[PDB]
Amino acid sequence: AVPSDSQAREKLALYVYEYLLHVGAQKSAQTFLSEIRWEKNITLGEPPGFLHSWWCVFWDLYCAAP
Amino acid sequence: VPSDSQAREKLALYVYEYLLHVGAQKSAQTFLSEIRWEKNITLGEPPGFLHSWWCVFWDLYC
Amino acid sequence: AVPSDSQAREKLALYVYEYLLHVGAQKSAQTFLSEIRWEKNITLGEPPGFLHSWWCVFWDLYCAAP
Amino acid sequence: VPSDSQAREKLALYVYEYLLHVGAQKSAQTFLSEIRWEKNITLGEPPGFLHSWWCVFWDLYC
Numbered sequence A, C: 001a002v003p004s005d006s007q008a009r010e011k012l013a014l015y016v017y018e019y020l021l022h023v024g025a026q027k028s029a030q031t032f033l034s035e036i037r038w039e040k041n042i043t044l045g046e047p048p049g050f051l052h053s054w055w056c057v058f059w060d061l062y063c064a065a066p
Numbered sequence B, D: 001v002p003s004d005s006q007a008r009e010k011l012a013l014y015v016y017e018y019l020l021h022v023g024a025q026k027s028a029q030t031f032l033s034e035i036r037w038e039k040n041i042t043l044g045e046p047p048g049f050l051h052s053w054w055c056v057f058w059d060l061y062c
Helices: A006-022 A026-035 A050-063 B004-021 B025-034 B049-061 C006-022 C026-035 C050-063 D004-021 D025-034 D049-061
Strands: none
Touching (some): A006 A050, A006 B004, A050 B049, A050 D049, B004 B025, B004 B049, B049 C050, C006 C050, C050 D004, C050 D049, D004 D025, D004 D049
C-alpha cells in the first residue's frame, strides 16, 4: 500500500519515454505516455539521454566478470 | 569491452520487455515497427531485466 | 586543470571514511582524513553506509553475466 | 548470488587499494591491522578498481 520504489519507477518511465524519442520511435513514446496515464511533467535533459548513458555503464559492468 | 552495437541492441530488447510488462503493449509493438526490429523477440518474467536492475541502482543514489 | 570527476572523488573519500568508521577501523579513518588533507564537512548518513550499500549492488552486477 | 562474506572481503581489499593509490599509506596499513586482515594482499594499477567504477557510476547520477 505504501510504495517503496515509487520514484524509481516514475523515473524509469520518464527516461524510457526520452529513450523512445531519441531512437526515433516517436509514436511509441506518445503511445507509452497514454498507456501508462502519465500525469507528470516531462523535462528532458541534454542528449544523450539518461537511459542510454546509464545503459552504457550498466552493460559494461554486466559483461565484466571477476 | 562490449561493442556499442551489442549494447544498443540489448537496450532495445530490454526496453521492449519493459514496455510489455508495464502494460504498454501498443507502445511496445509500435517500438519494434519504428526501429525496424527484425530479429527474434524474446522476453522473460515481469517486470523485466531493465526494471529490476534500474530500481536497485536508483535506490542507492537516493 | 579543470577537474571532471571532482565531485565523484570527493564523495568517494567521504564514503570511504564512513566505511572505515563503520567496520571499526577508527584509527584508519582518522589517519585517512589527515593524509588527504580533508577540508570539507563530514556528514554521515544512517547506516549501513553508502559505500557498503553501493558495493552490495555493484558486486552483484559485477558477478552477474550474460 | 555472491555471498555476503565474499562481497565484504572484496570491498575491504579494494578499499585498501584505494587508500594506497590516493596516497593514504599510513591509513591503509592501519586498516589492515584494525580489521585483522590475514590473507594475501595484492593490488593493481592506480587509481584502482573501486575508484574506477565509482567515478563512472557517480557521473551517471549527476
